[PDB]
Amino acid sequence: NPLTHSTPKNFGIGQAVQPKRNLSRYVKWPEYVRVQRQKKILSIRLKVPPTIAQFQYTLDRNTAAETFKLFNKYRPETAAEKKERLTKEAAAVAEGKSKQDASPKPYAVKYGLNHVVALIENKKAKLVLIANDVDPIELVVFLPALCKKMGVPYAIVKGKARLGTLVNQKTSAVAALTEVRAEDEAALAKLVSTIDANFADKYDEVKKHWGGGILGNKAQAKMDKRAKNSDSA
Amino acid sequence: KALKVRTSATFRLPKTLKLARAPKYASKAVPHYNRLDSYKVIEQPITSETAMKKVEDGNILVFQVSMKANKYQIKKAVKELYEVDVLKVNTLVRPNGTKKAYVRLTADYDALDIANRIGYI
Amino acid sequence: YATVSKTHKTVSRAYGGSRCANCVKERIIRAFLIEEQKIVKKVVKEQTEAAK
Amino acid sequence: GRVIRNQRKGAGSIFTSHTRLRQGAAKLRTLDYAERHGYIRGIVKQIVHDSGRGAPLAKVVFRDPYKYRLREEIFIANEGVHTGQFIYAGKKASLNVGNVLPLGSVPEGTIVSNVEEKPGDRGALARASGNYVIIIGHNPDENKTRVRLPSGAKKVISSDARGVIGVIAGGGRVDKPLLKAGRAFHKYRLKRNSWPKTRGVAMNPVDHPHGGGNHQHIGKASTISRGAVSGQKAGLIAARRTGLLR
Amino acid sequence: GAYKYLEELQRKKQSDVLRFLQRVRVWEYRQKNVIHRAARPTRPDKARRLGYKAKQGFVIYRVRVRR
RNA sequence: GAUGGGGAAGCUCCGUUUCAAAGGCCUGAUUUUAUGCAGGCCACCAUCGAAAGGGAAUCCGGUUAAGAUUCCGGAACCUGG
RNA sequence: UUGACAUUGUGAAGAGAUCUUUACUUAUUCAAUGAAGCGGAGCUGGAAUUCAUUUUCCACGUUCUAGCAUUCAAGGUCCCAUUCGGGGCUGAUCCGGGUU
């Protein structure tokens, strides 16, 4: 207390070598980082046509959680289950003379983007989820147009990873239900009614809009102070 | 949620584990036997009048030693073959393309005594 | 110099084997009388607050 | 024909600069926070002679802001500086000889040297000895500044462009007759291989456009079009007038 | 199948959507090296009718030649 | 003069720290065992290029048909451990 | 050295029955640095002169001197289980991560 002294260090330029601060904003990133950050900035600055930007309207977290808990019931067989039931029918079918229909009718989510697209065309899809993902965007951009054309409900949900876990893949890019059990028959239509509203019923009016055109916020702040302070002196 | 704190603007490779080799097969499968050994280091003595005049005087053995041998391998294979102890080794490459060695045994020995033990004197 | 005792390479002042002892005499004068007048400057910045 | 002597300087073999004794590239300090929001003080350690140049250099030693050390830089020394001088650098610095300020910070009629074309090029204009630019006016909106280049041209630059106050040392240099071919030999050994110059008149039709003939004479006009092409250009190039002034 | 739709979309290269993608992509590549590794085809059905399969040992590279 | 990159049908050219995720240290943390995990660091970032430039340290006497500041005898010195 | 087409997107003014200005930024181009202090809002005074109350910009730790400035920072405060010391907040305003 008597012996301890109070230094204070004076950062007033001109003196006191600066302290260590957080430079996280200023660092020079790798050139792969800096590409994928400006590949986002450049899709925001440009004017994105109406058939893009119909993505980025995506099912919000509430109906999202409600949506998967329906599909989560219907997940396809795993490898082991298939491995397991390939023993049963072997022992079941050959012995008891049965026709190898001995197993129940499976009800599972349909996946793959060549299969689902062919389901929609024969109108066998009761719902469809779509990932705002798929960097090769052209794969997925006509689906809202077929669904709305063929009178199939559809949705756009964030991520192909979550769409991938219920199919047991890494990534998926689509999902569908062509069949549903009577316990979930009523729980199905409560999702559709909320899903038809925000996607397939807004489809026509969304095709007017052009997204993007958002200025970065050092440009936005200089625009405003020119656009505001023109008027008010 | 929040981000890191970097006190310096430089981003360098994160140091990631390096993994030692675990070869499936081996390389040459037979380790090569000792290439330069006791007997291949010193092939012959040197019998010329000038050579033999040091042996019988200055207690110095004079050998024709292989080209690949250095003063460490020589001092070691004189001790091993001929049993002696060595003060000093001096070497020169003769201008026929071979190397001569002047090996000076310690005062505990007489090179003349060992010189005639292997059959030259 | 790697072979030599340290008394050959040094003198026993501060800044021994480096500055010429009249360059140490100054930078003591200059370190004392600059941070002397520098205290008188910081009271005037307390007075210039209350004086105005 | 042959390839002439001025076409032969481009490939730059024996024509490069003689760089050995040069103290370094004389520049101003990198433009940073401390200098554009305030000032930072160095002191000039020694003002010294640079080879190949006509003007002395000064070495001022700053203190690095973000790391403990000293950093010393090479300024072309303005006339009147002296070792032991404090040299202040930054927006809020003061108007005195040797202090480097932005040009917007100085009144019109101020004499500065080693001024920058664009902010942060570490100096361009008026670096030769005795030269200076004058600040003749400002343009506080869409910020510019009106300065008079040492030739007499009037250029308009940014107002964030720094420049150092005063005249560059080494004035009066060309007042002294050179007097002999030896002293011009010791001049260009430290610069480059330009010297001596054989008159293109005195060489053959291969060596030059002016060569040949049973008398020494050019034979066609010595003024050449700006739209001439490689190797045609020798003599007075694209001149608007010619001949002794009156 | 889904590849008869992608086929026709890439035959309209001045359509307002693809001339957006062409503009965002060409900026991507010009930052990358002149020859670099493509983790995945940009035209899955264009490569596929040329003999590409999706399996280990079919590799895609992206190459930029002066014009 | 490689590397990274950039041209070039190509042989190869540019450039030499350049639009680069370019590297291994000082020991504290261990007394299960040696080195995990630790804070801090330092950003100079190939190599080549001189028997006349820079540079760690050796002298006298004797000796051979022909070698010696090298061999002999004696008296020193430097460097790494 | 010029014109046209392509790179090449966003839209306003003014003349001519297409041109000249001029805006936007993200492409494209240039420049700097061991990609550190950008843009926006703030608090303190205060030039300011108040026609309701702030309308607005400037500010905002260093100038007799060839001294000195580095160890998560001393101080201040509070935690953890006191054990020697360690972890927080501030000292050093906050937000957007567009390196300028």
Kind of pairing between the strands at D86-90 and D144-148: unpaired
Rounded-to-integer distance, Cα C29 and Cα C42, Å: 20
**Rounded to 5 degrees, what angle do the CA atoms D52, D53, D59 make?**
115
String of b and e for A51-80 (b: at least 16 CB within 10 Å)? bbbbbebbbeeebbeebbebbebbeeeeee
Other Cβ atoms less than 10 A from the Cβ of C42: the count is 8
Rounded-to-integer distance, Cα A138 and Cα E10, Å: 9
One-letter amino acid for residue A66 of the chain: E
Considering only CA atoms, name the residue closest to the C1' of nucleotide G31. D121
Rounded-to-integer distance, Cα A202 and Cα A186, Å: 24
Q: Are D144 and D102 in contact (CB under 8 A)?
A: no
Nearest to B7 among A20, A28, A30 (CB): A20
Task: Give the DSSP per-residue string, C1-52.
Answer: -TTS-TTTT--SSSSTTTS-SSHHHHHHHHHHHHHHHHHHHHHHHHHHHHH-
Rounded-to-integer distance, Cα D60 and Cα D85, Å: 9
Rounded-to-integer distance, Cα D189 and Cα A14, Å: 44
- Give SS3 for E30: helix
Task: Give the DSSP per-residue string, D198-211.
Answer: --GGGS-TTT-TT-
Q: Which residue has the tokens 């890494």?
A: A170
One-letter amino acid for residue A68 of the chain: F
Count CA within 13 A, CB hemisphere, residue A64.
14
What separation, in Å, do the N-terminal and C-terminal C-alpha atoms of chain B show?
Answer: 92
Rounded-to-integer distance, Cα B62 and Cα B46, Å: 6
Beta bridge partners of B65: B42, B99
Task: Give the DSSP per-residue string, chain B.
Answer: ------SSSB--PPP--------SS-SSSSPPPPSS-HHHHEEEE--SHHHHHHHTTT-EEEEEE-TT--HHHHHHHHHHHH---EEEEEEEEETTTEEEEEEEE-TTS-HHHHHTTTT--
Rounded-to-integer distance, Cα D131 and Cα D118, Å: 19
Q: Which residues contact B121 (CB under 8 A, 6 or more apart)?
A: B52, B55, B112, B115
Distance E58 CA to F24 C1' (A): 39
| Burial status of residue C7 (CB atoms within 10 A of its CB: 0-12, 13-18, 19 or more) | exposed
In chain E, which residue's Cα lies nearest the Cα of A113? Answer: E2
Rounded-to-integer distance, Cα E1 and Cα A115, Å: 7
Task: Give the DSSP per-residue string, D176-234.
Answer: S---STTTTHHHHTTT-S--S---GGGS-TTT-TT--SSS----S-SEE-TT--TTT--
Rounded-to-integer distance, Cα D165 and Cα D80, Å: 11
**Ramachandran quadrant class, E36 (left: phi over 0; alpha: psi -120 to 50; beta: rest):** beta
String of b and e for B47-82 (b: at least 16 CB within 10 Å)? eeeebbebbeeebbbbbebbeebeeebbbebbeeeb
Strand F–CB B94 distance below 7 A: no
D186-to-A51, D93, D183, D189, D190 alpha-carbon distances in Å = 75, 41, 5, 6, 7
Q: Which nucleotides along chain F are within 7 A of a protein C-beta?
A: 5-9, 19-24, 40-43, 64-66, 70-72, 77-79
| Whether A31 contacts chain E with CB within 8 A | yes
Strand F–CB E50 distance below 7 A: no
Please, what's the largest Cα pairwise distance for chain C? Answer: 67
Kind of pairing between the strands at D223-224 and D86-90: unpaired
Alpha-carbon dihedral B74, B80, B81, B84, rounded to 10 degrees: 90
Rounded-to-integer distance, Cα D16 and Cα B18, Å: 48
Of A216, A218, A201, A144, the C-alpha closest to A174 is A144
Contact A139 E9 (CB under 8 A): no
Count CA within 13 A, CB hemisphere, residue B58.
13
- Give SS3 for D162: strand
Q: Which residues contact C31 (CB under 8 A, 6 or more apart)?
A: none
Rounded-to-integer distance, Cα A131 and Cα D138, Å: 58
Q: Which helix (DSSP H) or strand (DSSP E) does residue A192 occupy?
A: helix A182-195
Of E40, E46, E8, E56, the C-alpha closest to A133 is E40
**Rounded to 5 degrees, what angle do the CA atoms A30, A34, A38 make?**
175
- Give SS3 for A21: coil
Rounded-to-integer distance, Cα D178 and Cα D119, Å: 38
Q: Which residues contact D190 (CB under 8 A, 6 or more apart)?
A: D18, D21, D51, D52
Per the document, the length of chain D is 246
Beta bridge partners of A110: A176
Rounded-to-integer distance, Cα D235 and Cα D238, Å: 9
D157-to-B103, D26, D141, D142, D147 alpha-carbon distances in Å = 84, 21, 13, 11, 8
Peptide bond into D196 cis (omega under 30): yes
Q: Which chains touch D (3 or more CB pairs under 8 A)?
A: A
* Shortest CA to C1' contact from D12: nucleotide: F14
The experimental technique used to determine this model is: cryo-EM
Chain E residues inside the 8 Å CB shell of A43: 24
Q: Are D165 and D95 in contact (CB under 8 A)?
A: yes
Q: In the numeric block, which tokens belong to residue A53?
A: 């930007």
Rounded-to-integer distance, Cα A11 and Cα A17, Å: 7
Distance B11 CA to F37 C1' (A): 22
Query: What backbone torsions phi and psi does residue D46 show, to the nearest 5 degrees?
Result: -150, 140
Q: Are A153 and A200 in contact (CB under 8 A)?
A: yes
D191-to-C39, D16, D77, D124, D195 alpha-carbon distances in Å = 53, 9, 20, 19, 10
Query: How many cross-chain Cβ pairs, A to E, lie less than 8 Å apart?
Result: 49
Q: Are A196 and A153 in contact (CB under 8 A)?
A: yes
Cα four-point dihedral sign C44, A5, D63, C19: positive
Rounded-to-integer distance, Cα D180 and Cα A204, Å: 92
Strand G–CB C33 distance below 7 A: yes
Q: Which residues contact D137 (CB under 8 A, 6 or more apart)?
A: D108, D145, D146
Query: What backbone torsions phi and psi does residue B44 show, to the nearest 5 degrees?
Result: -145, 160
Q: Are D198 and D8 in contact (CB under 8 A)?
A: no
D24-to-A4, A76, C42, D75 alpha-carbon distances in Å = 48, 73, 41, 10
Min Cα separation A66/chain D (Å): 53
| Whether E4 contacts chain A with CB within 8 A | no
Min Cα separation E30/chain A (Å): 11
| Burial status of residue A117 (CB atoms within 10 A of its CB: 0-12, 13-18, 19 or more) | buried
Q: Are A66 and A127 in contact (CB under 8 A)?
A: no
Of E36, D50, D67, the C-alpha closest to B8 is D67
Beta bridge partners of D160: none
Q: Are B106 and B87 in contact (CB under 8 A)?
A: yes
Of A89, A63, A42, the C-alpha closest to A155 is A63
Other Cβ atoms less than 10 A from the Cβ of D81: the count is 20
Distance A79 CA to F30 C1' (A): 46
Query: How many cross-chain Cβ pairs, A to D, lie less than 8 Å apart?
Result: 20
Q: Are B113 and B106 in contact (CB under 8 A)?
A: no
Rounded-to-integer distance, Cα D225 and Cα D239, Å: 8
Rounded-to-integer distance, Cα A201 and Cα A192, Å: 11
Q: Which helix (DSSP H) or strand (DSSP E) does residue D148 occupy?
A: strand D144-148
A213-to-A2, A144, B65, D45, E67 alpha-carbon distances in Å = 64, 23, 86, 55, 32
Of A200, A168, A159, A144, the C-alpha closest to A72 is A168
Strand F–CB B11 distance below 7 A: yes
Q: Which residue has the tokens 């030599």?
A: C4
Beta bridge partners of D111: D134
Beta bridge partners of D43: D61, D86
Angle between helices A113-121 and A143-150 (to 10 degrees): 20
| Burial status of residue A137 (CB atoms within 10 A of its CB: 0-12, 13-18, 19 or more) | middle
Of D198, D168, D183, D206, the C-alpha closest to D77 is D168
Min Cα separation B66/chain A (Å): 57
Chain A, window 4-33: residues with a beta carbon less than 8 angstroms from a chain B beta carbon: 20-24, 26-30
Distance C3 CA to F78 C1' (A): 10
The gap from C-alpha D216 to its chain's centroid, in whole angstroms, comes to 37
Q: Are A145 and A128 in contact (CB under 8 A)?
A: no
| Whether A3 contacts chain D with CB within 8 A | no
Q: Which residue has the tokens 């599972």?
A: A108
Q: Do chains A and C touch (3 or more CB pairs under 8 A)?
A: no
Rounded-to-integer distance, Cα A137 and Cα A160, Å: 13
Other Cβ atoms less than 10 A from the Cβ of D181: the count is 9
Alpha-carbon dihedral D23, D25, D30, D31, rounded to 10 degrees: 130
| Whether A137 contacts chain E with CB within 8 A | yes
Q: In the numeric block, which tokens belong to residue A130?
A: 């779509």
Count CA within 13 A, CB hemisphere, residue A80.
0
Rounded-to-integer distance, Cα A53 and Cα D225, Å: 59
A129-to-A143, A150, D218 alpha-carbon distances in Å = 10, 15, 87
Report all structural domains of chain A as residue ranges with CATH numbers, in order of start. 30-216 (3.30.1330.30)
Q: Are A134 and A143 in contact (CB under 8 A)?
A: no
Q: In the numeric block, which tokens belong to residue C33?
A: 């009388």
Beta bridge partners of D101: D163
Q: Which residues contact B39 (CB under 8 A, 6 or more apart)?
A: B77, B81
Angle between helices A61-71 and A182-195 (to 10 degrees): 150
What's the per-residue H, E or C state across A116-150?
HHHHHHCCCCCCEEEECCCCCHHHCCCHHHHHHHH
Q: Are D98 and D164 in contact (CB under 8 A)?
A: yes
Rounded-to-integer distance, Cα A127 and Cα A129, Å: 7
Q: Are D136 and D108 in contact (CB under 8 A)?
A: yes
Numbers of helices and strands, H then E, in chain E: 3, 2
String of b and e for D158-174 (b: at least 16 CB within 10 Å)? bbbbbbbbbbbbbbeee
The gap from C-alpha E5 to its chain's centroid, in whole angstroms, comes to 16
One-letter amino acid for residue E67 of the chain: R
Q: Which residues contact A109 (CB under 8 A, 6 or more apart)?
A: A71, A74, A75, A76, A166, A167, A175, A176, A177
Rounded-to-integer distance, Cα D5 and Cα A229, Å: 63
D158-to-D123, D144, D161 alpha-carbon distances in Å = 13, 5, 6
Rounded-to-integer distance, Cα D221 and Cα D243, Å: 13
Min Cα separation B14/chain A (Å): 12
Please, what's the largest Cα pairwise distance for chain E? Answer: 37
Strand G–CB A222 distance below 7 A: yes
